[PDB]
Subunit: 303 residues, 4 copies
DNA sequence: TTCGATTGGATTGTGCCGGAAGTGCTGGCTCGAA
DNA sequence: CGATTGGATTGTGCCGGAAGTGCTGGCTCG
């Protein structure tokens, strides 16, 4: 049975453990540097095996030694209370990286800690894992927002909207209007039929970009959709589903960029990243991609 | 709890009943004119509730009276032939079933499978009196399942991450719209440009899709698992108000320039039945193919 | 599509909304008296429809008006105390008035503690039929018992079956005689020394004190409670007719009337379809009496 | 991704491949000695990955070569009618052949035998394949008890899975139905009998129906394959996902119930290493006698190969 | 001897804890680094 | 000269035509 270690047992970590039990995906270690809290969350969550008809062990840990034998490692831990946080979190990535190198070098790694396109590269470098075995959360979450908003305007099933958002997670994310479909049909056909206007689409783009802030302004925090997105990625690996999912991955010349991680459609299968798909962007799209990657580079230079 | 009546309990009916219990979608009546056989199949299937943790009653019936109170009616009954003399026989069958739906469950959502489906669904529509948004025919979900699958195996992605539209009619004149294929939301043409798959291979896959039933029958098997799964995807989208976009046969009222006939097109299936009929903005060549499919449907409608 | 209203959008509410979308069970209104927060949680949760391939509307509300047309109402609101009767009574009065006015045909699940009192108060003030309102208790408590036993015997957790009756709280009645494993009496595993009588007693104590244990570990128990509640709600919404131990109005069972208590029930499409009275021996009956007496005692303090 | 080889692609095999795709459990090889048909079934079934959102390869095979690297092997192949005890040597022959291949090609596979009489055939395949006793079991109790559980649940109007029951000894007419061990929502059946929700006579009628179910279905011009396939997949899934379900299956007895060197139906725990526990029920005298009779019939047939 | 307390969190805040008030925080404590 | 442990509508080694809730004439393989 797979061993899944959640490095970070905060809000997103907790929902991830709950979903893993629901789906009977594997044993779970809820790790946190904070004492006792993850053991308490783990004890609560373990009882839900009964309701789920599952059998996943869910335990808490405050020791990185429990990374031993992990098949999947999901990193959410890090400071959130700004550029000033960058060296702090770098420190954490170094620490985690060391342990991965020593304890679970064959693990598949998903990084969530923000800014994710920086943090995922730092952990890649410090852990020594292969480029096909480490990715960052970005596109699956962002595009879930876009797909959902469009679906609500057009009154269709959310999953039947497809869309691509690339480059980076965060305010520089590249929303590609040209690549939106509904039930396989170009969005433009629905714009032509006046079911949705270009202005409404732009409003939805802005809302997609601003969604985390919208949720925080309402005195909540985004963790349910992020957790679900991360588990969709992990499951595609663990069950070798080969879903196309937009994640942050090492660029080796794609879009004209190297030595940097960026969001792009990827195929996630049993061996990890099995394909990196490079979209055939036009010049304005490429300029937006360049600006996203430039912001990632700028922040990386500040660690 | 929804009542689902399977009018026809052959091999497709057996798989549909199995899947309904797996998904705990509703009580099932397995109807057939053949005596005792559907009672036997229903008895076998009912025990699988234990393994599924479901609670769907599954019963067999040789009486149309059990259509009473049906929320969903799926019609697979009718004479078959391996892949025109059937048109009058199956017309008479649609008349009989229609009379019973009209009198026993006029509010049911109807899914027609009986071939040639684009003709038979209109005949049942006419003799049942149900509203145009409450009856559809199986076509696109099945055919596109083949297309999506074959492409996905050449590109090494999850089969459902391929999207495709096949329209017009269910049969040899099905319109396969190359322009509308995507993979993980990306136009297929980008994969052709990168030589991940060629134009010629896609042509070969179109031909294989059209001829898949024949391919399976030549291998001494009968296609019924994929058809059953497609039908249950449709029925579930209605029962759970999911509003999936699914290509099915529906009454055309001017779309693509045609009226008074049923044809395959993308539809939204929700709690009120067909909620939207989506007309694709086809170019001239695509429209010519659509025309040919609907013309074949018309040709056959003239032979009942 | 069913409409499910969560009256209370705290941490248990959040997990319930998450699970409802995962299972595509119905549209969800997350209500709370706290402004803006439930709209935020609802927004976050709504996006998970994509990942789940579901289509549930999830919205937030600070208005009881949105109870209108609810098929299921789950009440978790109320003041809490870490491991108030008049306060939460006033809340049950308010909510009850709105259910009576806006959704009198809803199926009601009460979680607000002490649950066996609060469920009766909401029953009285809402006017809903006795077969349409129950309290959370047994499904959660027995999930603890079943889990701990399964981990000592190394079997799938749900293959342990057990009944805990009477009340949800320290006076819960743990029926050792009714525990089975893969359908086999627990006593056979004790005879074979796969588990001891003493270990079973230690597990009973742990089950009773699990909320305290979780709080002592600096966490709040809300995942398993949310899952238990959704199992109950789902049994109603899909007419599954599961046997689930819940708090229900007693009308003579176990020698008691005019009070709610935990007993095995059948939950189906019409609500509580059967109330099953266990054939308890004298000792078990005395424990049941103690649980109910505590519920009555507290009911006198509203 | 696990490799599941279906040795036999008839009615039960077909439904098993359908369910494996529905549950995304693994790649499937539909083997049969009959040419072409399994390739056809596999082609049809493979398209259902789209509707199921799964990604299982489903292929057909007429060669035992494809047992290579199997993680799970499910054996339904064998004679069911004359080309009756006369079938026993024929099927023995088949078990010999399969066994050789398993030994050479997938000795680490988990094996589920369905070919009837299962309690005999499973031991023959055990002997000829050389796999460990914790890696091979026979279908029996999960199916038979699904019948008993279902009929009881319908009389009492509860969820079928909330009825628990144990049927032991052998899969066939000598199956041992244990009234003492029936519970409903975890409550002893006797409480429902005391409450006149169901009578002792009705329970006896249901026991008879449970024993007679296969015949009842055949008499109605059908054949049992949906519930058998579901039962088999429940067993296989408990192995593949390490669920550690308690499931009644046919397993090698080494003294339990007073028998050795024979397979019989008993509650087992199925986990990631195979049979993790064999649970011996503390049967009373009458129950143990019925168990004895079941095992005696298995031995009688085993003596005729 | 002084004085801050992990990348998390219940109702409130938030190193931990009890007592208190009641849609709701802080005064007193231990441990350990500087 | 009977035909793998399977099967569509029917039966059932295979295939094609025929009739129409529905089989068997003609063929070829070792
Ligand atoms: Mg902190
Ligand atoms: Mg044969």
């Amino acid at each position: 049975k797979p061993k899944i270690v959640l490095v970070g047992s905060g809000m997103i970590g907790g929902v991830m453990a709950t979903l893993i039990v629901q789906k009977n995906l594997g044993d779970v270690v809820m790790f946190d540097v904070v004492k006792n809290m993850p053991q308490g969350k783990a004890l609560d969550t373990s009882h839900s095996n009964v309701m789920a008809y599952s059998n996943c062990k869910v335990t808490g840990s405050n020791s990185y030694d429990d990374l031993k034998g992990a098949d999947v490692v999901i990193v959410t831990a890090g400071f959130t209370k700004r550029d000033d946080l960058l060296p702090l979190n770098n420190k954490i990535m170094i620490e985690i990286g060391g342990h991965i190198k020593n304890l679970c070098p064959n693990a598949f790694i998903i990084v969530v800690t923000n800014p994710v396109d920086v943090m995922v590269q730092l952990l890649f470098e410090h852990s020594g894992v292969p480029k096909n075995k480490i990715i960052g959360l970005g596109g699956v979450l962002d595009t879930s927002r876009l797909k959902y908003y469009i679906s609500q305007k057009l009154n269709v099933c959310p999953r039947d909207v497809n869309a691509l958002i690339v480059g980076a997670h965060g305010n520089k994310m590249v929303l590609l209007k040209r690549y939106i479909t509904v039930g396989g049909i170009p969005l433009q056909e629905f714009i032509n039929n006046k079911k949705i206007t270009d202005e409404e689409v732009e409003g939805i783009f802005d809302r997609t970009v601003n969604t985390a802030l919208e949720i925080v302004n309402l005195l909540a925090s985004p963790y349910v959709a992020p957790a679900a997105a991360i588990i969709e990625m992990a499951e595609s690996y663990l069950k070798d589903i080969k879903k196309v999912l937009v994640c942050s991955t090492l660029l080796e010349g794609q879009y004209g960029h190297s030595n940097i991680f960026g969001g792009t459609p990827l195929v996630i299968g049993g061996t990890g990243v099995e394909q990196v798909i490079e979209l055939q962007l036009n010049a304005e799209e490429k300029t937006k991609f360049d600006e996203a990657v430039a912001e990632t580079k700028r922040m990386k230079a500040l660690i």
